[PDB]
């Protein structure tokens, strides 16, 4: 009945616990000590961190809880506006934009994105096959090049041309600094950086003046409910939203996937063997990517251990009781600590920290709400299928074309922004000399 | 593009008289030894291809290219199992409903509710064995069938077959075990007495199920999920006709293949004393209470490996059938047209030396220490894909609980030096397998 709570810092309460460069991993350690639920207090704020499937499946009851904007999302809202990810469910523009943009993430839409995904994936393979002997790969940096370019091309027919650069694009230079101010919360840079983004979004809009992409549905798509299309201001927020949401969590997944592969050679061989027998053409087709089952299992197990969007927030729609012993009042917050939920020994067994993609051969074997890397309910990730198709294509192409070596025997160091990434992860790729 | 081998033919009967034998799975295994990874098998009105290598079977398990086919054996079982889960086609509406309605009752979480009743039946087995007089022996497959039938009856439907109080098995299964016999005999096959008996058999099995369905305060069991469960997709519950078919289906599928596994597991243990001692040592240090708990059974890792290795050599459901959803090519050299059949010869697949090495015939549970070490689709005792065994974990929990309790409570002796004689129905079992058990005098 009484909720545990970590150590306090006087009038600052629990807030200095987050004054660290790895806040998610610190919260995981607290969850290891205090268990499935603990209170977290800050000046002006109270929330509860859930970490067990037993409590989180109740929090995922959409009749009792709705998506809440965490403090991290409130700061992203200062430039993402009422885009899909930083709007409340009751805001008119959420459901409107939701109804207009859901078709562009359908299976018929994924078939149309596929050619442009392969375009960027080929650029990645050719960069690696053009390396000299004893040169290494900076994995998360190259994966960020790929995912940013994919969403730019597939979504808006804009070429960031990240593989022609050392220093990333001027647009995201503002982003990582603007997102830095958001996570760290200099105010001059934030305002000057926010303008830089709107200036790109203008170039992307003016240039569209054909195509079958996200940007088309935003200018021409009409919400069946209200009959209205999106107004100019909201489209600009969606572009910013999709540029951000569309790349960084996907590049973390690919980076973590390759990390776990080179640390588990038995899993690597099974995935490489599948890639070899399935990807028989010089360019993978859409149907061939759907056939990479074990590769998809690899990606899901990487998302289990290190889900790159590591939390989401909920609030109680009415007075209710959680787990039969924790009464909540209307408006109270919850935080779903996804990495801890995915380490629930009562769901996954004792080998939670081991990388075994074989857990995911049967999706029906996994209990309800035990696996939530993409959020929950109507506010779940709209880009899930985009993300998994791109990552499966790219990982399959990587496994087909190269043998990989953990030549520094890398020690996992997870850098935390609002997402997770293995920092300093480097490998060597020995080409298999299979032409494209 | 290669031409497919084929065994000897019998004129207009083609290959069919090859199955006119009392050990057809072992006969098909011998043909696979002669002809290799694939061979065509023809019968009047029927053609299928038997796969035996991981190389081809890993392709056949691609669900975008192949779907479950009802073999001639499953078609005959359908005459009384109806559109139950095991004898329905994937596109039949009642498959996906019953599948969506019944998966929760087979979840790893769900076993915790079955566990007490599994222990109920397992204690009766231990107490029967410690109550034997000196120099009395155990009839292993007979007692394992007593246990598994009672477990599925109790855990699934709160019905007590009370097999450990009987010499002659239950009247229901006498019809059931005879119905599977007549169905099996029809493949190899004036027969009016066979058809009169068959319908009378369906009547005994049905009327018993309608006793419970008509008879049945709620419960944890399967039957509760069937009467109250609603398909999340269509919102509909099962109709009464399908429910009875599921009961018949689960009564059959729930016990017969599981008792063969336990029988084969105990056979291999007493033929490999070093493995038995290693398994017995784990049982002792883990089963520290008079009654095993759910957690402790989960901790019997080596026992689970023992059961997996028994399933490798003699998978008690020895085959399953597939059909090509579209024109495709198997292995780059065998073209298949839409609708063509395959048969997966599971015991032969599990003897692929390119997967397991040259010691394929040796009982070594350590092969299953790492699941990530096993190549894809090399181990298929429970079928494939969405049409895989729904009761897989029920079976493995029951067998692990029962086998661990046996190894904790008795030392076993192969006092006749039993020669393995595998009886074939639609499943496999070691016939005539008998042992002596010296109680260790550990109370319950
Ligand atoms: C690759 C791995 C990805 C992960 C782990 C991930 C994670 C998540 C999570 C957890 C949420 C729910 C956040 C919340 O409930 O507060 C979410 C929402 C969202 N994601 Fe992703 N995402 C991924 C890929 C993508 C991609 C590729 C796109 C764009 C194409 C995208 C666009 C969005 C959008 C628009 C939302 C908001 C949906 C809504 O509010 O209705 N995501 N994502
Ligand atoms: C060691 C024990 C067992 C083995 C080796 C085994 C084997 C198999 C195999 C190979 C299949 C696929 C058949 C096919 O594809 O045609 C299957 C399906 C099935 N099994 Fe089992 N089984 C076992 C135990 C059980 C138990 C205990 C139950 C019931 C609780 C059960 C119920 C079923 C059902 C209902 C199906 C059909 C599932 C569907 O098609 O959706 N089995 N089993
Ligand atoms: O735990 C987290 C991390 C959640 C960020 C996920 C962002 N993302 C990115 C893509 N899709 C979602 N954030 C808390 C920290 C906090 C708690 C209490 C008081 C102050 C701060 C919060 O911001 O509320
Ligand atoms: O022998 C078998 C073995 C099938 C038994 C599997 C039944 N089971 C029981 C529980 N789980 C599965 N299958 C073929 C034989 C045949 C080949 C060619 C022509 C006619 C018959 C078939 O029945 O089609
Ligand atoms: C709170 C920030 C905001 C952003 C866009 C529209 C309305 C409000
Ligand atoms: C979840 C929907 C909602 C709608 C209006 C107010 C609060 C919540
Ligand atoms: C990280 C810098 C860089 C520079 C050139 C090619 C690839 C990477």
GROMACS .gro file of C-alpha atoms in nm, chain A:
model
  436
    1UNK     CA    1   0.000   0.000   0.000
    2UNK     CA    2   0.279   0.242   0.090
    3UNK     CA    3   0.499   0.330  -0.208
    4UNK     CA    4   0.881   0.317  -0.183
    5UNK     CA    5   1.082   0.626  -0.273
    6UNK     CA    6   1.453   0.684  -0.345
    7UNK     CA    7   1.684   0.910  -0.145
    8UNK     CA    8   1.591   1.277  -0.126
    9UNK     CA    9   1.799   1.594  -0.141
   10UNK     CA   10   1.610   1.820   0.097
   11UNK     CA   11   1.387   2.081  -0.075
   12UNK     CA   12   1.495   1.952  -0.422
   13UNK     CA   13   1.336   1.610  -0.331
   14UNK     CA   14   1.442   1.345  -0.584
   15UNK     CA   15   1.541   1.582  -0.866
   16UNK     CA   16   1.925   1.571  -0.825
   17UNK     CA   17   1.903   1.196  -0.896
   18UNK     CA   18   1.840   1.302  -1.257
   19UNK     CA   19   2.139   1.542  -1.248
   20UNK     CA   20   2.343   1.271  -1.419
   21UNK     CA   21   2.447   1.191  -1.774
   22UNK     CA   22   2.277   0.847  -1.765
   23UNK     CA   23   1.934   0.910  -1.609
   24UNK     CA   24   1.752   0.606  -1.753
   25UNK     CA   25   2.020   0.367  -1.628
   26UNK     CA   26   2.013   0.536  -1.287
   27UNK     CA   27   1.635   0.493  -1.275
   28UNK     CA   28   1.683   0.127  -1.368
   29UNK     CA   29   1.919   0.085  -1.073
   30UNK     CA   30   1.661   0.247  -0.843
   31UNK     CA   31   1.397   0.008  -0.981
   32UNK     CA   32   1.630  -0.283  -0.906
   33UNK     CA   33   1.647  -0.166  -0.543
   34UNK     CA   34   1.287  -0.057  -0.477
   35UNK     CA   35   1.092  -0.294  -0.702
   36UNK     CA   36   0.793  -0.267  -0.932
   37UNK     CA   37   0.680   0.083  -0.826
   38UNK     CA   38   0.841   0.385  -0.663
   39UNK     CA   39   0.749   0.748  -0.611
   40UNK     CA   40   0.956   1.024  -0.770
   41UNK     CA   41   0.917   1.379  -0.641
   42UNK     CA   42   1.048   1.706  -0.783
   43UNK     CA   43   0.969   2.071  -0.709
   44UNK     CA   44   0.618   2.109  -0.847
   45UNK     CA   45   0.587   1.753  -0.977
   46UNK     CA   46   0.514   1.398  -0.859
   47UNK     CA   47   0.523   1.082  -1.071
   48UNK     CA   48   0.537   0.706  -1.020
   49UNK     CA   49   0.776   0.478  -1.209
   50UNK     CA   50   0.629   0.141  -1.310
   51UNK     CA   51   0.856  -0.149  -1.397
   52UNK     CA   52   0.653  -0.475  -1.375
   53UNK     CA   53   0.423  -0.622  -1.639
   54UNK     CA   54   0.161  -0.674  -1.366
   55UNK     CA   55   0.118  -0.301  -1.305
   56UNK     CA   56   0.197  -0.176  -1.656
   57UNK     CA   57  -0.076  -0.384  -1.823
   58UNK     CA   58  -0.324  -0.197  -1.604
   59UNK     CA   59  -0.165   0.138  -1.690
   60UNK     CA   60  -0.213   0.039  -2.055
   61UNK     CA   61  -0.591   0.020  -2.006
   62UNK     CA   62  -0.690   0.314  -2.225
   63UNK     CA   63  -1.026   0.344  -2.049
   64UNK     CA   64  -0.838   0.428  -1.727
   65UNK     CA   65  -0.521   0.606  -1.846
   66UNK     CA   66  -0.431   0.844  -2.130
   67UNK     CA   67  -0.096   0.961  -2.266
   68UNK     CA   68   0.067   1.234  -2.056
   69UNK     CA   69   0.329   1.478  -2.181
   70UNK     CA   70   0.637   1.413  -1.971
   71UNK     CA   71   0.868   1.704  -1.893
   72UNK     CA   72   1.092   1.580  -2.175
   73UNK     CA   73   0.799   1.592  -2.418
   74UNK     CA   74   0.691   1.936  -2.293
   75UNK     CA   75   1.034   2.072  -2.385
   76UNK     CA   76   1.024   1.900  -2.725
   77UNK     CA   77   0.680   2.061  -2.773
   78UNK     CA   78   0.849   2.403  -2.777
   79UNK     CA   79   0.952   2.326  -3.135
   80UNK     CA   80   0.746   2.015  -3.224
   81UNK     CA   81   0.427   2.205  -3.132
   82UNK     CA   82   0.104   2.007  -3.154
   83UNK     CA   83   0.263   1.752  -3.384
   84UNK     CA   84   0.155   1.393  -3.340
   85UNK     CA   85   0.401   1.301  -3.065
   86UNK     CA   86   0.383   1.615  -2.846
   87UNK     CA   87   0.008   1.683  -2.861
   88UNK     CA   88  -0.251   1.571  -2.608
   89UNK     CA   89  -0.516   1.320  -2.713
   90UNK     CA   90  -0.794   1.573  -2.651
   91UNK     CA   91  -0.635   1.836  -2.877
   92UNK     CA   92  -0.828   1.851  -3.204
   93UNK     CA   93  -0.510   1.839  -3.413
   94UNK     CA   94  -0.399   1.499  -3.281
   95UNK     CA   95  -0.687   1.285  -3.406
   96UNK     CA   96  -0.706   1.498  -3.721
   97UNK     CA   97  -0.338   1.449  -3.808
   98UNK     CA   98  -0.367   1.087  -3.690
   99UNK     CA   99  -0.647   1.012  -3.937
  100UNK     CA  100  -0.469   1.193  -4.221
  101UNK     CA  101  -0.128   1.029  -4.174
  102UNK     CA  102  -0.210   0.669  -4.073
  103UNK     CA  103  -0.267   0.565  -4.440
  104UNK     CA  104   0.088   0.674  -4.528
  105UNK     CA  105   0.218   0.403  -4.291
  106UNK     CA  106   0.004   0.123  -4.442
  107UNK     CA  107   0.143  -0.185  -4.617
  108UNK     CA  108   0.063  -0.030  -4.956
  109UNK     CA  109   0.260   0.276  -4.846
  110UNK     CA  110   0.554   0.065  -4.726
  111UNK     CA  111   0.585  -0.089  -5.073
  112UNK     CA  112   0.621   0.261  -5.217
  113UNK     CA  113   0.881   0.365  -4.960
  114UNK     CA  114   1.087   0.053  -5.029
  115UNK     CA  115   1.274   0.170  -5.340
  116UNK     CA  116   1.398   0.484  -5.163
  117UNK     CA  117   1.498   0.286  -4.853
  118UNK     CA  118   1.715   0.067  -5.076
  119UNK     CA  119   1.863   0.381  -5.233
  120UNK     CA  120   2.002   0.491  -4.896
  121UNK     CA  121   2.094   0.138  -4.787
  122UNK     CA  122   2.304   0.093  -5.102
  123UNK     CA  123   2.493   0.413  -5.018
  124UNK     CA  124   2.575   0.262  -4.678
  125UNK     CA  125   2.700  -0.068  -4.822
  126UNK     CA  126   2.913   0.109  -5.082
  127UNK     CA  127   3.069   0.339  -4.822
  128UNK     CA  128   3.177   0.035  -4.621
  129UNK     CA  129   3.305  -0.156  -4.925
  130UNK     CA  130   3.511   0.153  -5.015
  131UNK     CA  131   3.701   0.153  -4.685
  132UNK     CA  132   4.071   0.075  -4.692
  133UNK     CA  133   4.228  -0.215  -4.504
  134UNK     CA  134   4.248  -0.172  -4.124
  135UNK     CA  135   4.000   0.118  -4.136
  136UNK     CA  136   3.707   0.080  -3.898
  137UNK     CA  137   3.339   0.179  -3.891
  138UNK     CA  138   3.182   0.422  -3.645
  139UNK     CA  139   2.853   0.236  -3.613
  140UNK     CA  140   2.602   0.478  -3.451
  141UNK     CA  141   2.734   0.769  -3.657
  142UNK     CA  142   2.684   0.578  -3.983
  143UNK     CA  143   2.344   0.445  -3.873
  144UNK     CA  144   2.234   0.802  -3.798
  145UNK     CA  145   2.347   0.899  -4.148
  146UNK     CA  146   2.127   0.622  -4.289
  147UNK     CA  147   1.811   0.676  -4.084
  148UNK     CA  148   1.814   1.055  -4.124
  149UNK     CA  149   1.859   1.021  -4.500
  150UNK     CA  150   1.587   0.756  -4.524
  151UNK     CA  151   1.318   0.965  -4.355
  152UNK     CA  152   1.421   1.273  -4.553
  153UNK     CA  153   1.398   1.088  -4.884
  154UNK     CA  154   1.102   0.858  -4.815
  155UNK     CA  155   0.904   1.120  -4.624
  156UNK     CA  156   0.972   1.446  -4.805
  157UNK     CA  157   1.185   1.365  -5.113
  158UNK     CA  158   1.465   1.573  -4.960
  159UNK     CA  159   1.825   1.452  -4.974
  160UNK     CA  160   2.027   1.533  -4.664
  161UNK     CA  161   2.320   1.358  -4.839
  162UNK     CA  162   2.464   1.258  -4.502
  163UNK     CA  163   2.716   1.018  -4.659
  164UNK     CA  164   2.884   1.314  -4.833
  165UNK     CA  165   2.958   1.488  -4.501
  166UNK     CA  166   3.187   1.470  -4.199
  167UNK     CA  167   2.994   1.720  -3.988
  168UNK     CA  168   2.621   1.634  -3.991
  169UNK     CA  169   2.364   1.848  -4.168
  170UNK     CA  170   2.314   2.210  -4.052
  171UNK     CA  171   1.949   2.127  -3.978
  172UNK     CA  172   2.026   1.861  -3.718
  173UNK     CA  173   2.319   2.062  -3.581
  174UNK     CA  174   2.045   2.288  -3.446
  175UNK     CA  175   1.845   1.980  -3.341
  176UNK     CA  176   2.103   1.804  -3.127
  177UNK     CA  177   2.180   2.139  -2.964
  178UNK     CA  178   1.810   2.226  -2.924
  179UNK     CA  179   1.733   1.878  -2.790
  180UNK     CA  180   2.040   1.919  -2.568
  181UNK     CA  181   1.886   2.230  -2.411
  182UNK     CA  182   1.563   2.034  -2.367
  183UNK     CA  183   1.731   1.738  -2.194
  184UNK     CA  184   1.963   1.959  -1.992
  185UNK     CA  185   1.669   2.166  -1.866
  186UNK     CA  186   2.196   2.889  -2.388
  187UNK     CA  187   1.845   3.027  -2.427
  188UNK     CA  188   1.980   3.245  -2.709
  189UNK     CA  189   2.104   2.940  -2.901
  190UNK     CA  190   1.772   2.762  -2.847
  191UNK     CA  191   1.579   3.049  -3.007
  192UNK     CA  192   1.834   3.088  -3.287
  193UNK     CA  193   1.835   2.710  -3.341
  194UNK     CA  194   1.455   2.690  -3.352
  195UNK     CA  195   1.457   2.937  -3.641
  196UNK     CA  196   1.709   2.729  -3.838
  197UNK     CA  197   1.462   2.438  -3.840
  198UNK     CA  198   1.167   2.641  -3.966
  199UNK     CA  199   1.395   2.761  -4.247
  200UNK     CA  200   1.459   2.402  -4.363
  201UNK     CA  201   1.086   2.311  -4.337
  202UNK     CA  202   1.021   2.612  -4.567
  203UNK     CA  203   1.274   2.480  -4.825
  204UNK     CA  204   1.113   2.135  -4.809
  205UNK     CA  205   0.764   2.291  -4.850
  206UNK     CA  206   0.851   2.535  -5.135
  207UNK     CA  207   1.040   2.255  -5.319
  208UNK     CA  208   0.721   2.047  -5.321
  209UNK     CA  209   0.568   2.253  -5.610
  210UNK     CA  210   0.460   1.387  -5.869
  211UNK     CA  211   0.517   1.194  -5.547
  212UNK     CA  212   0.372   0.941  -5.302
  213UNK     CA  213   0.516   1.023  -4.961
  214UNK     CA  214   0.436   1.170  -4.620
  215UNK     CA  215   0.456   1.528  -4.747
  216UNK     CA  216   0.189   1.466  -5.013
  217UNK     CA  217  -0.064   1.334  -4.761
  218UNK     CA  218  -0.006   1.641  -4.544
  219UNK     CA  219  -0.079   1.899  -4.816
  220UNK     CA  220  -0.358   1.703  -4.990
  221UNK     CA  221  -0.489   1.467  -4.722
  222UNK     CA  222  -0.825   1.542  -4.564
  223UNK     CA  223  -0.943   1.409  -4.229
  224UNK     CA  224  -1.254   1.195  -4.294
  225UNK     CA  225  -1.408   1.308  -3.964
  226UNK     CA  226  -1.390   1.687  -3.994
  227UNK     CA  227  -1.340   1.691  -4.372
  228UNK     CA  228  -1.053   1.940  -4.310
  229UNK     CA  229  -0.692   1.924  -4.425
  230UNK     CA  230  -0.402   2.025  -4.204
  231UNK     CA  231  -0.330   2.397  -4.176
  232UNK     CA  232   0.010   2.541  -4.265
  233UNK     CA  233   0.135   2.567  -3.907
  234UNK     CA  234   0.055   2.207  -3.812
  235UNK     CA  235   0.217   2.063  -4.126
  236UNK     CA  236   0.537   2.241  -4.027
  237UNK     CA  237   0.516   2.076  -3.684
  238UNK     CA  238   0.460   1.732  -3.839
  239UNK     CA  239   0.766   1.774  -4.062
  240UNK     CA  240   0.978   1.863  -3.758
  241UNK     CA  241   0.817   1.576  -3.565
  242UNK     CA  242   0.883   1.313  -3.832
  243UNK     CA  243   1.238   1.431  -3.901
  244UNK     CA  244   1.317   1.379  -3.533
  245UNK     CA  245   1.103   1.077  -3.447
  246UNK     CA  246   1.187   0.921  -3.784
  247UNK     CA  247   1.561   0.879  -3.741
  248UNK     CA  248   1.726   0.878  -3.399
  249UNK     CA  249   1.537   0.591  -3.234
  250UNK     CA  250   1.583   0.383  -3.551
  251UNK     CA  251   1.959   0.436  -3.565
  252UNK     CA  252   1.992   0.338  -3.200
  253UNK     CA  253   1.810   0.012  -3.271
  254UNK     CA  254   2.040  -0.073  -3.562
  255UNK     CA  255   2.344   0.021  -3.352
  256UNK     CA  256   2.230  -0.196  -3.061
  257UNK     CA  257   2.140  -0.479  -3.300
  258UNK     CA  258   2.490  -0.484  -3.450
  259UNK     CA  259   2.644  -0.462  -3.102
  260UNK     CA  260   2.455  -0.768  -2.979
  261UNK     CA  261   2.536  -0.952  -3.302
  262UNK     CA  262   2.914  -0.918  -3.268
  263UNK     CA  263   2.891  -1.007  -2.897
  264UNK     CA  264   2.691  -1.325  -2.973
  265UNK     CA  265   2.854  -1.508  -3.266
  266UNK     CA  266   2.601  -1.794  -3.270
  267UNK     CA  267   2.319  -1.545  -3.325
  268UNK     CA  268   2.523  -1.364  -3.590
  269UNK     CA  269   2.574  -1.678  -3.799
  270UNK     CA  270   2.204  -1.768  -3.790
  271UNK     CA  271   2.111  -1.415  -3.900
  272UNK     CA  272   2.384  -1.399  -4.165
  273UNK     CA  273   2.281  -1.741  -4.298
  274UNK     CA  274   1.920  -1.621  -4.331
  275UNK     CA  275   2.029  -1.299  -4.503
  276UNK     CA  276   2.235  -1.501  -4.752
  277UNK     CA  277   1.962  -1.746  -4.856
  278UNK     CA  278   1.679  -1.490  -4.867
  279UNK     CA  279   1.846  -1.187  -5.032
  280UNK     CA  280   1.925  -1.359  -5.362
  281UNK     CA  281   1.895  -1.047  -5.581
  282UNK     CA  282   2.139  -0.754  -5.609
  283UNK     CA  283   1.869  -0.528  -5.461
  284UNK     CA  284   1.637  -0.666  -5.191
  285UNK     CA  285   1.269  -0.659  -5.279
  286UNK     CA  286   0.986  -0.572  -5.042
  287UNK     CA  287   0.868  -0.934  -5.026
  288UNK     CA  288   1.221  -1.059  -4.956
  289UNK     CA  289   1.253  -0.823  -4.658
  290UNK     CA  290   0.927  -0.961  -4.513
  291UNK     CA  291   1.092  -1.306  -4.530
  292UNK     CA  292   1.382  -1.214  -4.297
  293UNK     CA  293   1.214  -1.358  -3.989
  294UNK     CA  294   1.524  -1.421  -3.775
  295UNK     CA  295   1.655  -1.072  -3.856
  296UNK     CA  296   1.325  -0.937  -3.727
  297UNK     CA  297   1.369  -1.153  -3.417
  298UNK     CA  298   1.716  -1.002  -3.372
  299UNK     CA  299   1.571  -0.651  -3.385
  300UNK     CA  300   1.293  -0.730  -3.137
  301UNK     CA  301   1.541  -0.876  -2.887
  302UNK     CA  302   1.762  -0.568  -2.920
  303UNK     CA  303   1.449  -0.360  -2.854
  304UNK     CA  304   1.384  -0.577  -2.548
  305UNK     CA  305   1.717  -0.508  -2.377
  306UNK     CA  306   1.769  -0.146  -2.490
  307UNK     CA  307   1.448   0.014  -2.623
  308UNK     CA  308   1.569   0.340  -2.771
  309UNK     CA  309   1.263   0.537  -2.661
  310UNK     CA  310   1.302   0.414  -2.304
  311UNK     CA  311   0.987   0.551  -2.139
  312UNK     CA  312   0.643   0.698  -2.188
  313UNK     CA  313   0.408   0.877  -1.951
  314UNK     CA  314   0.043   0.826  -1.857
  315UNK     CA  315  -0.213   1.003  -1.640
  316UNK     CA  316  -0.522   0.865  -1.469
  317UNK     CA  317  -0.845   0.965  -1.641
  318UNK     CA  318  -1.040   0.907  -1.317
  319UNK     CA  319  -0.988   0.806  -0.956
  320UNK     CA  320  -0.874   0.443  -0.964
  321UNK     CA  321  -0.668   0.181  -0.783
  322UNK     CA  322  -0.351   0.036  -0.938
  323UNK     CA  323  -0.270  -0.328  -0.866
  324UNK     CA  324  -0.532  -0.328  -0.592
  325UNK     CA  325  -0.315  -0.143  -0.339
  326UNK     CA  326  -0.201   0.187  -0.492
  327UNK     CA  327  -0.494   0.431  -0.509
  328UNK     CA  328  -0.447   0.704  -0.769
  329UNK     CA  329  -0.634   1.032  -0.799
  330UNK     CA  330  -0.753   1.181  -1.126
  331UNK     CA  331  -0.460   1.343  -1.305
  332UNK     CA  332  -0.184   1.152  -1.125
  333UNK     CA  333   0.113   1.058  -1.343
  334UNK     CA  334   0.276   0.727  -1.424
  335UNK     CA  335   0.605   0.659  -1.600
  336UNK     CA  336   0.653   0.327  -1.780
  337UNK     CA  337   1.021   0.230  -1.747
  338UNK     CA  338   1.041   0.016  -2.060
  339UNK     CA  339   1.391  -0.134  -2.004
  340UNK     CA  340   1.282  -0.260  -1.661
  341UNK     CA  341   0.947  -0.393  -1.786
  342UNK     CA  342   1.149  -0.591  -2.041
  343UNK     CA  343   1.359  -0.738  -1.756
  344UNK     CA  344   1.060  -0.875  -1.560
  345UNK     CA  345   1.184  -1.220  -1.457
  346UNK     CA  346   0.826  -1.333  -1.391
  347UNK     CA  347   0.756  -1.284  -1.764
  348UNK     CA  348   1.084  -1.369  -1.941
  349UNK     CA  349   1.251  -1.604  -1.693
  350UNK     CA  350   1.584  -1.574  -1.517
  351UNK     CA  351   1.796  -1.515  -1.831
  352UNK     CA  352   1.664  -1.161  -1.884
  353UNK     CA  353   2.006  -1.008  -1.952
  354UNK     CA  354   2.099  -1.263  -2.221
  355UNK     CA  355   2.048  -1.182  -2.590
  356UNK     CA  356   1.831  -1.465  -2.728
  357UNK     CA  357   1.622  -1.367  -3.033
  358UNK     CA  358   1.462  -1.712  -3.010
  359UNK     CA  359   1.224  -1.564  -2.750
  360UNK     CA  360   1.033  -1.405  -3.040
  361UNK     CA  361   0.957  -1.701  -3.268
  362UNK     CA  362   0.599  -1.692  -3.137
  363UNK     CA  363   0.452  -1.343  -3.087
  364UNK     CA  364   0.149  -1.516  -2.934
  365UNK     CA  365   0.367  -1.668  -2.660
  366UNK     CA  366   0.450  -1.321  -2.525
  367UNK     CA  367   0.191  -1.210  -2.266
  368UNK     CA  368  -0.007  -0.892  -2.320
  369UNK     CA  369   0.180  -0.565  -2.253
  370UNK     CA  370   0.506  -0.744  -2.171
  371UNK     CA  371   0.679  -0.596  -2.478
  372UNK     CA  372   0.621  -0.222  -2.533
  373UNK     CA  373   0.915  -0.066  -2.723
  374UNK     CA  374   0.666   0.128  -2.941
  375UNK     CA  375   0.430   0.265  -2.676
  376UNK     CA  376   0.067   0.179  -2.616
  377UNK     CA  377  -0.278   0.200  -2.772
  378UNK     CA  378  -0.395   0.476  -3.002
  379UNK     CA  379  -0.087   0.678  -2.899
  380UNK     CA  380   0.149   0.397  -3.000
  381UNK     CA  381   0.426   0.462  -3.251
  382UNK     CA  382   0.276   0.545  -3.590
  383UNK     CA  383   0.615   0.475  -3.750
  384UNK     CA  384   0.661   0.122  -3.614
  385UNK     CA  385   0.628  -0.053  -3.951
  386UNK     CA  386   0.845   0.204  -4.127
  387UNK     CA  387   1.111   0.159  -3.859
  388UNK     CA  388   1.110  -0.221  -3.862
  389UNK     CA  389   1.110  -0.248  -4.242
  390UNK     CA  390   1.403  -0.007  -4.278
  391UNK     CA  391   1.602  -0.173  -4.000
  392UNK     CA  392   1.533  -0.524  -4.131
  393UNK     CA  393   1.632  -0.428  -4.486
  394UNK     CA  394   1.951  -0.254  -4.375
  395UNK     CA  395   2.060  -0.522  -4.126
  396UNK     CA  396   1.990  -0.795  -4.381
  397UNK     CA  397   2.194  -0.609  -4.641
  398UNK     CA  398   2.474  -0.557  -4.388
  399UNK     CA  399   2.479  -0.926  -4.292
  400UNK     CA  400   2.471  -1.033  -4.656
  401UNK     CA  401   2.763  -0.817  -4.770
  402UNK     CA  402   3.012  -0.813  -4.479
  403UNK     CA  403   3.169  -1.017  -4.204
  404UNK     CA  404   3.199  -0.813  -3.885
  405UNK     CA  405   3.471  -0.803  -3.620
  406UNK     CA  406   3.467  -0.652  -3.270
  407UNK     CA  407   3.830  -0.554  -3.313
  408UNK     CA  408   3.851  -0.333  -3.002
  409UNK     CA  409   3.639  -0.578  -2.797
  410UNK     CA  410   3.410  -0.288  -2.721
  411UNK     CA  411   3.282  -0.230  -2.367
  412UNK     CA  412   2.919  -0.120  -2.385
  413UNK     CA  413   2.883   0.250  -2.301
  414UNK     CA  414   2.526   0.375  -2.348
  415UNK     CA  415   2.502   0.749  -2.408
  416UNK     CA  416   2.170   0.905  -2.309
  417UNK     CA  417   1.995   1.194  -2.480
  418UNK     CA  418   1.618   1.157  -2.495
  419UNK     CA  419   1.708   0.827  -2.668
  420UNK     CA  420   1.970   0.559  -2.607
  421UNK     CA  421   2.277   0.483  -2.818
  422UNK     CA  422   2.596   0.277  -2.778
  423UNK     CA  423   2.864   0.546  -2.785
  424UNK     CA  424   3.204   0.468  -2.930
  425UNK     CA  425   3.084   0.143  -3.085
  426UNK     CA  426   3.324   0.060  -3.369
  427UNK     CA  427   3.368  -0.249  -3.586
  428UNK     CA  428   3.560  -0.368  -3.891
  429UNK     CA  429   3.375  -0.500  -4.196
  430UNK     CA  430   3.547  -0.757  -4.416
  431UNK     CA  431   3.364  -0.746  -4.750
  432UNK     CA  432   3.223  -1.069  -4.892
  433UNK     CA  433   3.268  -0.920  -5.244
  434UNK     CA  434   2.907  -0.971  -5.354
  435UNK     CA  435   2.815  -0.710  -5.618
  436UNK     CA  436   2.520  -0.474  -5.599
   0.00000   0.00000   0.00000
